[PDB]
Amino acid sequence: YTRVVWCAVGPEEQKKCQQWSQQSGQNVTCATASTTDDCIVLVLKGEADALNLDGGYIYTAGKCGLVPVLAENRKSSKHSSLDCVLRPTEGYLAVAVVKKANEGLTWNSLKDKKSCHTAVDRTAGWNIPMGLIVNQTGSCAFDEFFSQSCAPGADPKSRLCALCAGDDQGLDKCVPNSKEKYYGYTGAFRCLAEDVGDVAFVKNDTVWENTNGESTADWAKNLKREDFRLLCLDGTRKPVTEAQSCHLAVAPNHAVVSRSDRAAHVEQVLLHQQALFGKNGKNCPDKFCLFKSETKNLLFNDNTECLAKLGGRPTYEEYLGTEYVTAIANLKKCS
């Protein structure tokens, strides 16, 4: 049989992959690139097999011919008697988060404020809020809307990267990988927690997972949920308990993609790997846990319960949904 070559984005994901590889007896091995788009190109070249992707990146990958294989499934809100691998996915809630103490601020007063995004091209961090903003403003100049932002993957000299902070050395300011302090869900929430920005575009789970002692990380360990508010599109502000009535969109879950001719094999191997190292896996926490990374969401989100099988052998557009695809395509006309 053949080995599965995973693609790690940046050096923190590489280290985790290398641990997985050792534990897997080289059933999985590792390629690494500096950005998600570069890992997508390694897969298109056949130099890696697969990686797990946010839906905005699935859009890129799917325009290039890669296909969805298995999706992240977090814990369901409702009792289900189905095994995790067979439970339908629920989608996550993209939200706009602000500090409660920043009292004037609503969706309708974002212009000229400071923003924190997960990365350019990602769902909650970029496609949904900027797609909404370009539409409501009637303008493609999304790069001149906020006074300053951290939007990993934008031009590092531009206002969209001005709040980014890079690594322990200021190296790699604004790169779209975990070496940027403000990258991803937890990075963009930290940018708001620290008052670097006025608003963060993340998902509902990020706010709960990084407050009220749910994270022991230094920057998060003392944050309280009640000190944050969600911006609803009708101009109101709500406590973070009200995400089901105050969100920007429901996003498709992150999912693994591969080339079509490797998808079946990638799927079989991941199903076995999560049986060893997944949540309650045979050898997690003893040896290695595929869905943990000290809150840093490396390779997978730390809140992944399993990777689940997809219904209907979906194309990428069927997985993302026609509404979302159409929103992305509308926004990409601006660039």
């Binding site: 788009d37 997508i40 190109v41 298109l44 890129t60 325009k63 290039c64 011919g65 395509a329 990409k332």
Partner: peptide, 6 residues
């Protein structure tokens, strides 16, 4: 809306 970015 049609081609690969790379």
């Amino acid at each position: 809306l049609e081609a690969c970015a790379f």
